[PDB]
Amino acid sequence: DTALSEFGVEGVATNIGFLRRLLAEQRLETGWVNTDFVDEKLPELAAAAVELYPGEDALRAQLAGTVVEVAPE
Amino acid sequence: PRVARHVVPQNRLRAYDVHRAIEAIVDVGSVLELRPDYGVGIVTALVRVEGVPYGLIANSTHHLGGAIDAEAADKAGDFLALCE
Amino acid sequence: NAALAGVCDVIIATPDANIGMGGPAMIEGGGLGVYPPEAIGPIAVQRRNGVVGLVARDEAHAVSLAKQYLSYFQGRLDRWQAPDPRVARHVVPQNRLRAYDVHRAIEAIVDVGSVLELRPDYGVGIVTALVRVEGVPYGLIANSTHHLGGAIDAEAADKAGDFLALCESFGLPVISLCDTPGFMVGPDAETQAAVRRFGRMFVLGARLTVPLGMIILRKGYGLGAMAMAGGSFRAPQFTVAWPTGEIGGMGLESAVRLGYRTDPAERQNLFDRLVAAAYQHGKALRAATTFELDDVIDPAASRAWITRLS
Amino acid sequence: GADYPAGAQLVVLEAMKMQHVLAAPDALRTVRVLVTPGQVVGTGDPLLVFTRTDLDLTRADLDEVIERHARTLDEGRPDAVAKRHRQGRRTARENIDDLVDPGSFVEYGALAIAAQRSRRSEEDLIANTPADGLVAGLATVGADRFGPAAAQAVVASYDYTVLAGTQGMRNHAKTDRVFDLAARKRLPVVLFAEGGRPGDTGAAGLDVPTFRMLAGLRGRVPLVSVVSGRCFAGNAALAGVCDVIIATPDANIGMGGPAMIEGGGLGVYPPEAIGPIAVQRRNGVVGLVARDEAHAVSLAKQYLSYFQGRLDRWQAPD
Amino acid sequence: PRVARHVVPQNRLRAYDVHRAIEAIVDVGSVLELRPDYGVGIVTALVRVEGVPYGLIANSTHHLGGAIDAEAADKAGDFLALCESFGLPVISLCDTPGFMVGPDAETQAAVRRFGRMFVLGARLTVPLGMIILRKGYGLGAMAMAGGSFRAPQFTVAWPTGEIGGMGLESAVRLGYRTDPAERQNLFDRLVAAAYQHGKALRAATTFELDDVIDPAASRAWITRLS
């Protein structure tokens, strides 16, 4: 997944999103899926698809998460 | 006015924020910078000095030391065509 | 020396040419190191970004082109030779799918050897060239199918707008050979600021005060087709089309793709039939019937129409 | 840009230490050359472009068109051309090609058909509504005596054979198109008005620019109106917004058509009792009275001549 | 303002005095009607709306039902040449079925005369606002506006307005042709009926009019003319 995310492609549409969505599936955490899996999950998976001027600093996220409250500008 | 005097650093190497410069000249709150995240090399803004409207362009040190690149040149060319 | 050269209308350069705003001494004075002059403005780099307008074989040729370029802004020619009217009739293949060379259509219309195409390796979707019909100087723009099927992209838009301003500035009537499905779309086309760049093509067409005649060679759809006319099929002095033409808000295959949505293997087939079928109810003769075109002409008459423009 | 036969040397590269010589794959003509002596190339890099080294073979396309066009002309309509000559009058195209200089006409909207698919079908509209009733376009008049530039002119005629030469959606759009040009190029207009439509009892065409456009050309360019037959309603309006009206004795011009005089409750009158060449000859509505159609076109050509230039050959009286 | 609302009679047949209409719009006492006993078909007057000078033309019902005849056409043509010449913005109150038709009308050189009204409106380069009081049909109604309903800066209408290529009755008299004694009956049945699908509101639906206003709004619109 990390590999697929760090893959930058611009200009041509790809299926990096689909594959990415596909690795996230759970049945697949068992080590394998069968010949029909990717077909019965296609529609489900198909759907699921800054500079600073001197004197300024940027407050970054310490770790991943969902923003609940932010200060005003 | 006396504030405009400290805007530019005496050490010719220490970069500075253009906005501090602009704000030290045009009257308070009259600045309206257009396309700030585009051709960032140069600032194009509509301002006011004693209530009169002016167009303003300015080289920003935060980019290439002030160097005018192909994109910041285009942007400034556009703004000059607007003012004219 | 370059600054002066790039403030001009055209730059005629020879293969051994190297143009750059900064001399190796400047690239060095700026701390970017040291480079040899042959690696600054290669006739290959400048041939593409639209910096060099005409590429000459040698010095005598460059001077030849310079003499020719001026000629369009200097006056009419007395001796002129018309092409074989018949050739025009066979430029566009009768099969809407088979592509063809735009240079052929241009050369089948404007009189013999009067074509001088500018910045050809730049914004290749649209051809911008100074030409002549019966001795008179005209500016000419044309869609080339060899690029995106004729779709107008952000950069062809730029090159076209530039030319429309040139023509307007020195007053050359314009000849527009249209063959486009419209502007090139897509989330990627949008990242190249297509909204702002196509807008400028409309603005400069709106500013044309010179006569502009439009001939639809094959395709002429949506805004892109309009932009090619000045912003409307009403702006041109005459908006005529060859028999191979087809007009509409959106290209046929585009209407089909949207009006018919199942085939696992080859949809391509049901498509080609649903498209060649819809093509009959979208010809040029039909749009001619509702006056959406001033006429559907015999390609040998193109000149006769382009004449009443001057 | 040089022609070379098959085998002819085209480029020379220096591989290891020896020299590889690239030649013409066959009879070709150089076009573009993207390579300069001295540069280092890689495998497969393009060095130059080229073109390897009947006209009467008719094609369907051009034919369907020739036909569709030819079905608009006089020849393709013996039926209607007979009824006209029967009545002792010329057809729209006969008058036009008489006025206009030999093949200088550039017709606009020839393949236009009426705008009513609800009272008819596309089939008969295409054969019974040629040019929607109006043959209009660019031309030259007196180009032999004056320049082909000064003799330029917009020319239009209503075809009585098509719906009594009445005005309709499509031909309105054609008059606008053509009156726009007269202005764009400051060209004189010669209008063969005559006539006076199914779905007219709706969308009121009160926003039609036609009348305002011609009226607005008044002092700008010479406006000539030729009238034979019946000229009522909008057709008359246009005719009376002009500089001169050349009419033939059989002419009847009136702002209101018998249908309008009737719709207003004033009863029913026959068209020969509306704008008699005698009434309009007096109140200054008709400026020139022609003996016949060929004479009216003759006078129209002469009238324009004064606004077109000087004459070289002239004979002084005694 | 609320007074302007009662000026035009709801019964599309009951004539009314134009002066009441004009006076309900322009400011009090600003009216100066010129040549009132001449070309009585149309009223040409110099007026004021919020102190600003305007030229005003208006069809009078008391004449031929509003019909524009050869003489009232001449008079209006003159006034439009006056306004244009002295840069006065025009106000056009329309209530005409069209140009007076008939064989007799054609004798008074109406083709040349109605044409002069068309040419003189085609030359107006001053703002012209138009308000259809009741009837606005045919080329006559177009002339009243410069030559096209698009020509005016605004072509608006009062609730009592009716638009069309030809008047309601003209349409009925043609598309329906039997009554021995009294036809006047069945006639005003087809008329009052057809009216519903030719009124102002319907026209406004297809944007053939810029709007159908509350007559108290007349000023607010005219005001935008200067």
Side-chain angles (χ1 to χ4, degrees):
Chain A
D1 196 74
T2 309
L4 270 177
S5 65
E6 297 181 347
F7 196 159
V9 180
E10 185 174 300
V12 180
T14 58
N15 67 312
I16 302 190
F18 178 74
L19 298 179
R20 201 87 173 297
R21 225 53 266 140
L22 187 61
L23 291 167
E25 285 286 357
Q26 175 183 48
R27 260 154 222 87
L28 182 41
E29 290 168 58
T30 70
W32 57 271
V33 304
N34 62 77
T35 310
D36 293 311
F37 187 81
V38 177
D39 286 277
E40 319 170 322
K41 292 261 182 293
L42 184 62
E44 298 174 45
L45 299 177
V50 174
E51 302 181 315
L52 318 167
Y53 290 70
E56 303 184 314
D57 282 299
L59 180 78
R60 299 163 183 294
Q62 303 278 293
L63 71 207
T66 284
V67 181
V68 179
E69 177 223 303
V70 186
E73 295 185 60
Chain B
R2 303 186 101 80
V3 147
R5 290 149 155 170
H6 303 289
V7 188
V8 182
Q10 299 197 60
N11 170 37
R12 70 182 297 290
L13 302 155
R14 203 155 298 168
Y16 69 114
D17 183 39
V18 283
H19 299 81
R20 305 276 65 186
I22 299 166
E23 270 160 46
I25 293 170
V26 309
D27 20 59
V28 183
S30 62
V31 179
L32 177 61
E33 180 178 355
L34 304 165
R35 308 204 289 176
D37 306 315
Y38 172 61
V40 317
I42 302 174
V43 170
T44 65
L46 287 168
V47 303
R48 285 200 146 95
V49 170
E50 295 203 332
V52 180
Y54 295 72
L56 184 159
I57 62 167
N59 303 116
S60 180
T61 306
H62 96 297
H63 195 55
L64 295 174
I68 304 171
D69 43 345
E71 183 183 280
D74 282 337
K75 176 184 152 182
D78 289 321
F79 196 60
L80 284 185
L82 176 76
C83 298
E84 165 61 7
Chain C
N1 288 61
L4 295 187
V7 120
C8 288
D9 274 305
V10 289
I11 288 188
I12 300 181
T14 33
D16 54 289
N18 264 285
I19 314 174
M21 271 296 277
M26 300 188 94
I27 296 162
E28 189 203 307
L32 312 188
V34 57
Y35 302 68
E38 281 86 331
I40 295 287
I43 194 58
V45 176
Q46 310 299 42
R47 192 168 196 167
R48 284 201 173 189
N49 55 28
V51 164
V52 166
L54 293 182
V55 183
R57 297 171 304 219
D58 74 296
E59 291 173 286
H61 182 55
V63 165
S64 179
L65 292 167
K67 289 180 180 164
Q68 179 174 49
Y69 179 71
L70 295 202
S71 79
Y72 300 84
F73 310 81
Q74 295 198 295
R76 304 179 161 184
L77 299 172
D78 285 304
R79 308 184 209 173
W80 51 272
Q81 162 187 52
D84 184 327
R86 302 199 266 82
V87 184
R89 284 155 172 168
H90 297 291
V91 182
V92 191
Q94 185 155 178
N95 179 301
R96 65 183 305 275
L97 299 162
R98 215 162 305 179
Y100 64 102
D101 185 54
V102 297
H103 293 64
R104 295 266 166 147
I106 303 175
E107 267 149 50
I109 304 182
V110 298
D111 42 50
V112 184
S114 62
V115 173
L116 171 56
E117 180 179 355
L118 301 177
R119 299 192 296 180
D121 318 302
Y122 172 63
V124 302
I126 298 172
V127 172
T128 69
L130 298 156
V131 304
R132 282 196 157 90
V133 173
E134 302 208 326
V136 179
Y138 299 71
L140 189 148
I141 60 179
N143 302 97
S144 185
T145 6
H146 97 306
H147 189 60
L148 284 166
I152 298 167
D153 45 343
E155 179 182 295
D158 285 354
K159 191 181 111 167
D162 275 38
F163 195 62
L164 287 187
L166 182 98
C167 293
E168 171 67 18
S169 217
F170 299 100
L172 295 156
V174 173
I175 291 177
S176 177
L177 294 183
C178 174
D179 189 324
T180 177
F183 292 115
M184 174 73 247
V185 290
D188 179 284
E190 309 304 335
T191 27
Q192 311 178 313
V195 178
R196 169 172 65 69
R197 291 213 245 158
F198 295 144
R200 181 174 159 291
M201 176 172 203
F202 265 108
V203 179
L204 302 188
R207 293 182 182 172
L208 280 154
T209 66
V210 301
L212 175 147
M214 174 149 106
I215 313 178
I216 329 286
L217 291 169
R218 204 210 282 302
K219 277 133 53 189
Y221 297 105
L223 293 175
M226 287 188 257
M228 281 277 133
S232 157
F233 276 28
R234 229 57 171 52
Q237 195 175 94
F238 69 71
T239 307
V240 97
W242 285 5
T244 33
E246 55 199 68
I247 305 304
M250 68 176 72
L252 301 182
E253 26 284 300
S254 187
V256 178
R257 289 208 182 86
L258 285 165
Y260 291 127
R261 317 184 305 148
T262 305
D263 282 35
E266 279 300 347
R267 58 150 231 179
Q268 233 296 300
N269 290 279
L270 172 47
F271 184 59
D272 302 323
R273 287 119 52 178
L274 234 35
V275 171
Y279 166 73
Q280 304 304 323
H281 320 305
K283 290 186 175 182
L285 285 178
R286 177 270 216 159
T289 244
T290 64
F291 204 64
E292 307 197 309
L293 293 182
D294 293 318
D295 208 55
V296 177
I297 65 166
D298 166 350
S302 298
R303 300 184 101 234
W305 282 78
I306 303 176
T307 270
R308 304 233 137 298
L309 213 52
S310 172
Chain D
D3 279 296
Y4 301 67
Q9 175 179 308
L10 297 180
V11 183
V12 176
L13 323 175
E14 285 216 63
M16 296 295 83
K17 287 287 191 172
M18 54 217 95
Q19 292 194 302
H20 189 97
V21 174
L22 295 183
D26 87 274
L28 63 82
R29 173 175 297 182
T30 306
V31 177
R32 308 128 60 178
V33 174
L34 19 169
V35 141
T36 286
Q39 55 173 174
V40 161
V41 296
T43 316
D45 289 42
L47 310 168
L48 74 67
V49 173
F50 57 84
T51 309
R52 288 199 178 65
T53 293
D54 193 0
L55 283 186
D56 296 292
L57 300 169
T58 188
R59 30 191 305 189
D61 296 319
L62 177 48
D63 280 290
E64 173 181 46
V65 167
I66 301 286
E67 174 50 34
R68 204 78 164 300
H69 263 66
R71 190 183 312 174
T72 304
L73 301 193
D74 270 9
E75 194 174 308
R77 307 175 73 211
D79 34 310
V81 180
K83 280 293 178 175
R84 284 303 299 182
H85 289 59
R86 196 192 309 312
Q87 298 178 296
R89 304 249 292 106
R90 284 180 173 180
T91 71
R93 291 170 183 286
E94 286 178 281
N95 276 153
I96 293 174
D97 275 85
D98 178 38
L99 169 69
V100 182
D101 287 309
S104 57
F105 201 70
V106 176
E107 196 175 320
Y108 273 68
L111 312 165
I113 62 171
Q116 40 182 279
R117 203 73 148 297
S118 42
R119 309 278 184 171
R120 302 192 189 188
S121 72
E122 190 185 315
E123 209 70 350
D124 76 303
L125 279 182
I126 300 184
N128 304 305
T129 308
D132 193 37
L134 179 63
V135 186
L138 296 205
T140 52
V141 182
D144 235 293
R145 212 172 297 159
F146 308 120
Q152 268 234 294
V154 164
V155 167
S157 173
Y158 280 85
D159 190 13
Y160 200 53
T161 68
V162 180
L163 307 211
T166 61
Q167 313 189 313
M169 230 156 276
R170 298 287 161 55
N171 82 54
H172 257 310
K174 293 210 309 179
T175 30
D176 298 314
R177 181 65 175 175
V178 126
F179 287 157
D180 184 70
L181 292 179
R184 307 267 215 76
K185 312 176 69 62
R186 307 177 192 186
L187 305 168
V189 180
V190 186
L191 180 57
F192 283 105
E194 166 177 16
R197 291 268 161 162
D200 295 316
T201 298
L206 296 177
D207 48 321
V208 177
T210 315
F211 308 103
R212 187 174 207 276
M213 292 189 49
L214 190 54
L217 284 178
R218 226 338 212 308
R220 337 287 301 307
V221 309
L223 300 190
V224 183
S225 187
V226 180
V227 175
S228 291
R230 312 185 199 314
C231 203
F232 302 122
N235 288 61
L238 295 187
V241 120
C242 288
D243 274 305
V244 289
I245 288 188
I246 300 181
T248 33
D250 54 289
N252 264 285
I253 314 174
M255 271 296 277
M260 300 188 94
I261 296 162
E262 189 203 307
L266 312 188
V268 57
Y269 302 68
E272 281 86 331
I274 295 287
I277 194 58
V279 176
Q280 310 299 42
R281 192 168 196 167
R282 284 201 173 189
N283 55 28
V285 164
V286 166
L288 293 182
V289 183
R291 297 171 304 219
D292 74 296
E293 291 173 286
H295 182 55
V297 165
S298 179
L299 292 167
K301 289 180 180 164
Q302 179 174 49
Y303 179 71
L304 295 202
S305 79
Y306 300 84
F307 310 81
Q308 295 198 295
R310 304 179 161 184
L311 299 172
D312 285 304
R313 308 184 209 173
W314 51 272
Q315 162 187 52
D318 184 327
Chain E
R2 303 186 101 80
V3 147
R5 290 149 155 170
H6 303 289
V7 188
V8 182
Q10 299 197 60
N11 170 37
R12 70 182 297 290
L13 302 155
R14 203 155 298 168
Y16 69 114
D17 183 39
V18 283
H19 299 81
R20 305 276 65 186
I22 299 166
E23 270 160 46
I25 293 170
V26 309
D27 20 59
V28 183
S30 62
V31 179
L32 177 61
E33 180 178 355
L34 304 165
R35 308 204 289 176
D37 306 315
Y38 172 61
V40 317
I42 302 174
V43 170
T44 65
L46 287 168
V47 303
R48 285 200 146 95
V49 170
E50 295 203 332
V52 180
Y54 295 72
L56 184 159
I57 62 167
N59 303 116
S60 180
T61 306
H62 96 297
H63 195 55
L64 295 174
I68 304 171
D69 43 345
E71 183 183 280
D74 282 337
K75 176 184 152 182
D78 289 321
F79 196 60
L80 284 185
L82 176 76
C83 298
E84 165 61 7
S85 189
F86 291 101
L88 273 166
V90 194
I91 306 182
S92 185
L93 305 190
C94 182
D95 194 329
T96 170
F99 290 116
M100 181 69 290
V101 286
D104 211 318
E106 308 312 313
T107 336
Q108 318 167 329
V111 161
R112 152 164 70 62
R113 301 216 228 172
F114 293 141
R116 180 169 157 289
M117 214 209 295
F118 256 102
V119 171
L120 294 178
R123 299 175 169 181
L124 289 175
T125 68
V126 311
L128 184 168
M130 178 151 93
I131 306 178
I132 319 272
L133 301 167
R134 198 213 290 302
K135 296 161 73 179
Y137 300 112
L139 290 71
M142 298 199 288
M144 281 293 97
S148 152
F149 265 41
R150 213 48 76 183
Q153 208 183 88
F154 66 76
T155 305
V156 95
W158 284 6
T160 27
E162 50 204 75
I163 294 305
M166 51 168 42
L168 284 175
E169 31 273 306
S170 183
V172 163
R173 288 206 179 70
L174 282 171
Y176 293 78
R177 301 189 261 172
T178 305
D179 284 66
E182 273 306 77
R183 54 152 262 184
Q184 295 297 287
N185 309 293
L186 175 62
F187 185 58
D188 306 308
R189 293 172 190 167
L190 286 52
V191 149
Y195 165 64
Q196 307 308 325
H197 320 295
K199 52 169 62 173
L201 256 179
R202 204 232 63 181
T205 231
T206 50
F207 201 62
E208 288 171 285
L209 283 170
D210 290 343
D211 201 36
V212 183
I213 61 164
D214 164 344
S218 302
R219 296 205 116 207
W221 280 77
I222 294 178
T223 266
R224 298 277 177 171
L225 222 51
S226 76

